[PDB]
RNA sequence: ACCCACUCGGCACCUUACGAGAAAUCAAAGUCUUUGGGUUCUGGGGGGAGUAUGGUCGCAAGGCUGAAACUUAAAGAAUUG
RNA sequence: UCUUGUAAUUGGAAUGAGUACAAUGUAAAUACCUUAACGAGGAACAAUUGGAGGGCAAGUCUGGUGCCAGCAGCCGCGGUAAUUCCAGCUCCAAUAGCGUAUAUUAAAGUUGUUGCAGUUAAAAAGCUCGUAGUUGAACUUUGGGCCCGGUU
């Protein structure tokens, strides 16, 4: 089930059992790599890059066509963000909910939800700092993290 | 003189059916107790318990007699009889009738290696009837039927010689224990062994073959 | 500061003391062989229990085990030398199948009655005691 | 499942959990507190010796009744006081004050044969001779 | 009728209807 | 009350179908006195 | 979560046996489930099984034929010294002449009588009779 | 908006026992004497007793943790009138 | 026509518990081993300890004492919260031992790793987060061929 909830949904994707080369695609293998480079130069997060690729140009996903995932292409060209996508979005969520809680001092639901979001951030950040993506301390604080995200 | 009233009654009356394994294998049902008497003789009887039971009406108090008895000759064929009648001897007769009507067999075995006319079971088996559980464990040669004397008498009439019996549950009652032990030895016969993995000829229910001389008059 | 002489007890009291089948069989044996009390039946039962325990944990050991070979051969040779098993029953499933009468048959009073010379087992025993 | 740990490396949890559970035992609790040395009448012993402090005719009922009546004795090592059942009648004429009696425990009770309220110390000896042998005229009670 | 309320320790409610009508522990060294 | 207790707990045995001893002038008596 | 795939694989086979089905589907597969089912197939207790291959971890279709009494897993995989083996059998097998308890030794995945013929022992895995 | 057929995820339902139970009953209380998927808390006859003492949070009310001596053979589910 | 039981029926055998020359034994002795002589006719040379409604084996026994606002009337009958108030007979078990007390162990799956239980019988924190602790999806050399050589 969910990590912090009682729900047990299973909505997801399902990659096809075909590891090669969609037949009608027949376009290129590197040209899509410079649209990766171009979109990353624009500043989009890798999930956004994947969804715009499969909505616009017929790329199913980059792992099957290019032979590489999106992040290793972005890191290869050196456009990789400092902290990854998901931790950054979690920090942004925590920041916004703390500003609202700062304005509205009686909202117990936001206090509970913020404790949940903080614990989720802590689990993910501990995973990252034990796999050598963050510096081995990285000290997630409650206030200065605002300047970390925006 | 007994007159057949059913299909297997006509089957056994003329003596065309003699081997009891044809009855057991296809599970031929029986509703009259005379079939086993005309088929298997010598079935020694012994009484478990006869007790008065009271049914209370608006004004009266009817007293009946519940009789439980057992039947088994000496060799792997057992029957238990629960009846309730209006008279003690009639209750014994009805109980032994239903006990001879519900005879089940027993597949015996050796505790360890195979040698010389099996004496015990072939599998540790459970039997449950209302918070009593009889667990039957095979035992070595000449180890004695280590059970309660009623249950020891039950397996002594059965045909086995040495069975360890760890029984768990409130054993102050008798009827629950005897029903649980009956189900235990029944499922002991029902517990499959790989020795029966050989190809079996699969008969076509030989009442079909003998349908010319077992039908209606 | 001297060693102990080791000691044990050859008899064993039964678990359920009061069982009419057990009391009847004990008294039947006592009449049939002329014993003094129930300690003799208990002692033969203890000897038989030891022998059957040895036989059980020898048979649970695999076939052709050298320990099984040596200890089983010694046990069977011993129990045919005393003459409880027969001559042609030199296998362990038979020594699982031993009875107490098969041991009391090989005593002294039973032999000095069975060989004549006494005409009664009680007379046999009192003729033993009188040297 | 079943509500207990089952890992291969969980043995410490099983040990400690068993220790606490065993602290909710009865005989273990009585034993490892050593309370058979502090509050028990006997000091964990089997018998004890005492001086008969007072004798009272506690009959079963009013005169047409059963003669099972007895005394209060003072322990000689502890200094404690307890009631201590004299057995079958005709032995009360053996027992008066200051007789140096030897007491044991009682044991069982049924629906007859003595269901006395908590008097659980049958007297074994009086004056250091016996009580059963004194009952069968085998010996005589010495004069002081 | 009605089944009685079941508790190993008596309720603080029932004890109020019951109750209306210094030295520490010893440890011998 | 010993005789009444034996009377109470003997008739129950017959309802269960269990053999019980017969009654006489030996039921509610001290079979063996203690010490 | 699914803390053991051998456990639920064996449980699924046993529920399909108790009900009276003919073939059963197991998700996911494993090397040890394949080898367990290999031994059980070799001793005849099941029918024949076939590994459906997708890229994730696969599934197994086991074609039963009855004649299997019980299969189960002994977790945790206790260490089993060789002299302990007999004791383990006497704990959880219906008799001694029939039934098997399955070891994972360094000489492979293999039942107890072959574990005695090859004269090796290791961890326990489960049992079948 | 409605109907029809699917599918995922919810809240309850009706019937049954292939199973389980002391019983009422229960798709879980099933897959448990044929007993081992992962894990946390709790319980060991009734009273004495949530009592005594100590610690601890609490302005107070109080809560949290929480015995021992002693005594005692006793203290859930249905049917029957 | 050959086998068991009974009897205030009967007969002769045997033998050590004991006594004791002696000799062995021993540091010297005692005792055991051997043995001259003596040593069994029943109250002898006599066996006890517990028990008898079921557990749990064995009374459809006998007698005595005390009370009854019960019948009879001085004989008695019956009852007797007298938990028998007291003795005897008969029977059962163990046996040169038998009982009792306290502690402990098995039966006990009432400490439960094997192996308990928590709707209602005692027992699932009011709920959620979370550190130590426990536990944690699948995959990486498989298969086939070759000989030699050991055991039933």
PDB file of C-alpha atoms in Angstrom, chain B residues 1-145:
ATOM      1  CA  UNK B   1     -34.655 -65.562   6.391  1.00  0.00           C
ATOM      2  CA  UNK B   2     -33.639 -62.159   5.049  1.00  0.00           C
ATOM      3  CA  UNK B   3     -35.144 -60.811   1.823  1.00  0.00           C
ATOM      4  CA  UNK B   4     -33.221 -58.319  -0.321  1.00  0.00           C
ATOM      5  CA  UNK B   5     -34.844 -54.883  -0.512  1.00  0.00           C
ATOM      6  CA  UNK B   6     -32.112 -53.004  -2.403  1.00  0.00           C
ATOM      7  CA  UNK B   7     -29.571 -53.441  -5.199  1.00  0.00           C
ATOM      8  CA  UNK B   8     -26.660 -54.622  -3.065  1.00  0.00           C
ATOM      9  CA  UNK B   9     -29.095 -56.783  -1.098  1.00  0.00           C
ATOM     10  CA  UNK B  10     -29.850 -58.711  -4.277  1.00  0.00           C
ATOM     11  CA  UNK B  11     -26.116 -58.618  -5.049  1.00  0.00           C
ATOM     12  CA  UNK B  12     -25.116 -60.294  -1.780  1.00  0.00           C
ATOM     13  CA  UNK B  13     -28.169 -62.573  -1.406  1.00  0.00           C
ATOM     14  CA  UNK B  14     -27.152 -64.958  -4.198  1.00  0.00           C
ATOM     15  CA  UNK B  15     -23.508 -64.772  -3.132  1.00  0.00           C
ATOM     16  CA  UNK B  16     -22.227 -63.367  -6.421  1.00  0.00           C
ATOM     17  CA  UNK B  17     -20.416 -60.653  -4.426  1.00  0.00           C
ATOM     18  CA  UNK B  18     -17.847 -61.910  -1.919  1.00  0.00           C
ATOM     19  CA  UNK B  19     -14.793 -59.594  -1.947  1.00  0.00           C
ATOM     20  CA  UNK B  20     -15.364 -56.500   0.194  1.00  0.00           C
ATOM     21  CA  UNK B  21     -12.787 -54.414  -1.703  1.00  0.00           C
ATOM     22  CA  UNK B  22     -15.200 -54.013  -4.627  1.00  0.00           C
ATOM     23  CA  UNK B  23     -17.629 -52.424  -2.160  1.00  0.00           C
ATOM     24  CA  UNK B  24     -14.923 -50.266  -0.576  1.00  0.00           C
ATOM     25  CA  UNK B  25     -13.161 -49.072  -3.741  1.00  0.00           C
ATOM     26  CA  UNK B  26     -16.194 -47.675  -5.551  1.00  0.00           C
ATOM     27  CA  UNK B  27     -17.781 -46.753  -2.170  1.00  0.00           C
ATOM     28  CA  UNK B  28     -20.933 -48.779  -2.635  1.00  0.00           C
ATOM     29  CA  UNK B  29     -23.540 -47.429  -0.204  1.00  0.00           C
ATOM     30  CA  UNK B  30     -25.566 -49.537   2.203  1.00  0.00           C
ATOM     31  CA  UNK B  31     -28.832 -48.847   4.018  1.00  0.00           C
ATOM     32  CA  UNK B  32     -29.583 -52.277   5.553  1.00  0.00           C
ATOM     33  CA  UNK B  33     -27.388 -53.887   8.206  1.00  0.00           C
ATOM     34  CA  UNK B  34     -27.941 -57.468   6.989  1.00  0.00           C
ATOM     35  CA  UNK B  35     -25.446 -57.046   4.122  1.00  0.00           C
ATOM     36  CA  UNK B  36     -22.363 -57.155   6.339  1.00  0.00           C
ATOM     37  CA  UNK B  37     -23.802 -60.088   8.315  1.00  0.00           C
ATOM     38  CA  UNK B  38     -24.370 -62.045   5.102  1.00  0.00           C
ATOM     39  CA  UNK B  39     -20.920 -60.886   3.920  1.00  0.00           C
ATOM     40  CA  UNK B  40     -18.549 -60.784   6.917  1.00  0.00           C
ATOM     41  CA  UNK B  41     -19.272 -63.149   9.837  1.00  0.00           C
ATOM     42  CA  UNK B  42     -17.849 -63.281  13.348  1.00  0.00           C
ATOM     43  CA  UNK B  43     -18.134 -59.541  14.028  1.00  0.00           C
ATOM     44  CA  UNK B  44     -17.526 -59.362  17.774  1.00  0.00           C
ATOM     45  CA  UNK B  45     -19.595 -56.743  19.600  1.00  0.00           C
ATOM     46  CA  UNK B  46     -18.966 -54.753  22.774  1.00  0.00           C
ATOM     47  CA  UNK B  47     -20.805 -51.863  24.444  1.00  0.00           C
ATOM     48  CA  UNK B  48     -19.386 -48.401  25.118  1.00  0.00           C
ATOM     49  CA  UNK B  49     -22.070 -46.461  26.961  1.00  0.00           C
ATOM     50  CA  UNK B  50     -25.807 -46.604  27.629  1.00  0.00           C
ATOM     51  CA  UNK B  51     -27.203 -43.523  29.334  1.00  0.00           C
ATOM     52  CA  UNK B  52     -30.672 -42.076  30.005  1.00  0.00           C
ATOM     53  CA  UNK B  53     -31.559 -38.798  28.291  1.00  0.00           C
ATOM     54  CA  UNK B  54     -34.431 -36.501  29.265  1.00  0.00           C
ATOM     55  CA  UNK B  55     -36.619 -34.470  26.906  1.00  0.00           C
ATOM     56  CA  UNK B  56     -38.839 -32.019  28.762  1.00  0.00           C
ATOM     57  CA  UNK B  57     -42.221 -31.092  27.289  1.00  0.00           C
ATOM     58  CA  UNK B  58     -44.733 -28.552  28.628  1.00  0.00           C
ATOM     59  CA  UNK B  59     -45.890 -30.921  31.391  1.00  0.00           C
ATOM     60  CA  UNK B  60     -44.113 -34.260  30.939  1.00  0.00           C
ATOM     61  CA  UNK B  61     -40.547 -35.566  31.008  1.00  0.00           C
ATOM     62  CA  UNK B  62     -39.811 -38.246  28.402  1.00  0.00           C
ATOM     63  CA  UNK B  63     -36.904 -40.569  29.244  1.00  0.00           C
ATOM     64  CA  UNK B  64     -35.037 -42.237  26.365  1.00  0.00           C
ATOM     65  CA  UNK B  65     -31.823 -44.273  26.244  1.00  0.00           C
ATOM     66  CA  UNK B  66     -28.798 -43.342  24.148  1.00  0.00           C
ATOM     67  CA  UNK B  67     -26.577 -46.329  23.363  1.00  0.00           C
ATOM     68  CA  UNK B  68     -23.128 -46.196  21.800  1.00  0.00           C
ATOM     69  CA  UNK B  69     -21.522 -49.533  20.900  1.00  0.00           C
ATOM     70  CA  UNK B  70     -18.741 -50.791  18.624  1.00  0.00           C
ATOM     71  CA  UNK B  71     -18.304 -53.600  16.094  1.00  0.00           C
ATOM     72  CA  UNK B  72     -15.113 -55.116  14.682  1.00  0.00           C
ATOM     73  CA  UNK B  73     -14.007 -58.712  14.216  1.00  0.00           C
ATOM     74  CA  UNK B  74     -10.227 -58.710  14.574  1.00  0.00           C
ATOM     75  CA  UNK B  75      -8.806 -57.306  11.358  1.00  0.00           C
ATOM     76  CA  UNK B  76      -8.962 -53.780   9.967  1.00  0.00           C
ATOM     77  CA  UNK B  77     -12.745 -53.244   9.832  1.00  0.00           C
ATOM     78  CA  UNK B  78     -14.509 -51.080  12.403  1.00  0.00           C
ATOM     79  CA  UNK B  79     -17.910 -49.581  13.094  1.00  0.00           C
ATOM     80  CA  UNK B  80     -19.271 -47.181  15.711  1.00  0.00           C
ATOM     81  CA  UNK B  81     -22.909 -46.999  16.738  1.00  0.00           C
ATOM     82  CA  UNK B  82     -24.710 -43.951  18.139  1.00  0.00           C
ATOM     83  CA  UNK B  83     -28.452 -44.463  18.611  1.00  0.00           C
ATOM     84  CA  UNK B  84     -31.227 -43.338  20.945  1.00  0.00           C
ATOM     85  CA  UNK B  85     -34.307 -45.487  21.514  1.00  0.00           C
ATOM     86  CA  UNK B  86     -37.190 -45.928  23.944  1.00  0.00           C
ATOM     87  CA  UNK B  87     -35.703 -49.094  25.472  1.00  0.00           C
ATOM     88  CA  UNK B  88     -32.204 -50.122  26.548  1.00  0.00           C
ATOM     89  CA  UNK B  89     -31.866 -53.418  24.657  1.00  0.00           C
ATOM     90  CA  UNK B  90     -33.581 -51.894  21.634  1.00  0.00           C
ATOM     91  CA  UNK B  91     -31.073 -49.047  21.811  1.00  0.00           C
ATOM     92  CA  UNK B  92     -28.217 -51.579  21.874  1.00  0.00           C
ATOM     93  CA  UNK B  93     -29.733 -53.408  18.894  1.00  0.00           C
ATOM     94  CA  UNK B  94     -30.190 -50.177  16.926  1.00  0.00           C
ATOM     95  CA  UNK B  95     -26.686 -48.990  17.803  1.00  0.00           C
ATOM     96  CA  UNK B  96     -25.064 -52.228  16.697  1.00  0.00           C
ATOM     97  CA  UNK B  97     -27.225 -52.145  13.551  1.00  0.00           C
ATOM     98  CA  UNK B  98     -25.955 -48.685  12.609  1.00  0.00           C
ATOM     99  CA  UNK B  99     -22.413 -49.684  13.644  1.00  0.00           C
ATOM    100  CA  UNK B 100     -22.541 -52.680  11.306  1.00  0.00           C
ATOM    101  CA  UNK B 101     -24.122 -50.407   8.690  1.00  0.00           C
ATOM    102  CA  UNK B 102     -21.240 -47.901   8.864  1.00  0.00           C
ATOM    103  CA  UNK B 103     -18.234 -50.247   8.837  1.00  0.00           C
ATOM    104  CA  UNK B 104     -15.081 -48.645   7.419  1.00  0.00           C
ATOM    105  CA  UNK B 105     -11.725 -50.345   6.739  1.00  0.00           C
ATOM    106  CA  UNK B 106      -8.168 -49.757   7.901  1.00  0.00           C
ATOM    107  CA  UNK B 107      -4.902 -49.756   5.965  1.00  0.00           C
ATOM    108  CA  UNK B 108      -2.295 -51.037   8.399  1.00  0.00           C
ATOM    109  CA  UNK B 109       1.464 -50.856   8.075  1.00  0.00           C
ATOM    110  CA  UNK B 110       4.872 -51.251   9.673  1.00  0.00           C
ATOM    111  CA  UNK B 111       6.447 -48.767  12.073  1.00  0.00           C
ATOM    112  CA  UNK B 112       9.855 -49.118  10.455  1.00  0.00           C
ATOM    113  CA  UNK B 113      11.094 -51.685   7.960  1.00  0.00           C
ATOM    114  CA  UNK B 114       8.690 -54.099   6.292  1.00  0.00           C
ATOM    115  CA  UNK B 115       8.700 -57.660   7.652  1.00  0.00           C
ATOM    116  CA  UNK B 116       6.027 -60.154   8.531  1.00  0.00           C
ATOM    117  CA  UNK B 117       2.297 -59.288   8.705  1.00  0.00           C
ATOM    118  CA  UNK B 118       1.878 -55.547   9.584  1.00  0.00           C
ATOM    119  CA  UNK B 119       0.907 -54.537  13.107  1.00  0.00           C
ATOM    120  CA  UNK B 120       0.447 -50.747  13.221  1.00  0.00           C
ATOM    121  CA  UNK B 121      -0.678 -47.782  11.136  1.00  0.00           C
ATOM    122  CA  UNK B 122       1.154 -46.092   8.274  1.00  0.00           C
ATOM    123  CA  UNK B 123       0.716 -42.397   9.144  1.00  0.00           C
ATOM    124  CA  UNK B 124       0.228 -40.136  12.137  1.00  0.00           C
ATOM    125  CA  UNK B 125      -3.335 -38.952  11.805  1.00  0.00           C
ATOM    126  CA  UNK B 126      -5.676 -36.478  13.478  1.00  0.00           C
ATOM    127  CA  UNK B 127      -9.290 -36.749  14.516  1.00  0.00           C
ATOM    128  CA  UNK B 128     -11.417 -33.980  15.999  1.00  0.00           C
ATOM    129  CA  UNK B 129     -14.941 -33.770  17.390  1.00  0.00           C
ATOM    130  CA  UNK B 130     -15.609 -30.808  19.656  1.00  0.00           C
ATOM    131  CA  UNK B 131     -12.355 -29.645  21.297  1.00  0.00           C
ATOM    132  CA  UNK B 132     -10.860 -33.122  21.614  1.00  0.00           C
ATOM    133  CA  UNK B 133      -8.143 -34.184  19.207  1.00  0.00           C
ATOM    134  CA  UNK B 134      -6.838 -37.725  18.956  1.00  0.00           C
ATOM    135  CA  UNK B 135      -3.448 -37.943  17.259  1.00  0.00           C
ATOM    136  CA  UNK B 136      -2.414 -41.461  16.272  1.00  0.00           C
ATOM    137  CA  UNK B 137       1.299 -42.244  15.954  1.00  0.00           C
ATOM    138  CA  UNK B 138       2.680 -45.591  14.715  1.00  0.00           C
ATOM    139  CA  UNK B 139       4.662 -47.578  17.259  1.00  0.00           C
ATOM    140  CA  UNK B 140       7.323 -50.342  17.151  1.00  0.00           C
ATOM    141  CA  UNK B 141       6.665 -54.063  17.505  1.00  0.00           C
ATOM    142  CA  UNK B 142       5.111 -55.192  20.771  1.00  0.00           C
ATOM    143  CA  UNK B 143       5.018 -51.715  22.302  1.00  0.00           C
ATOM    144  CA  UNK B 144       1.405 -52.006  23.478  1.00  0.00           C
ATOM    145  CA  UNK B 145      -1.606 -49.859  22.601  1.00  0.00           C
TER     146      UNK B 145
END
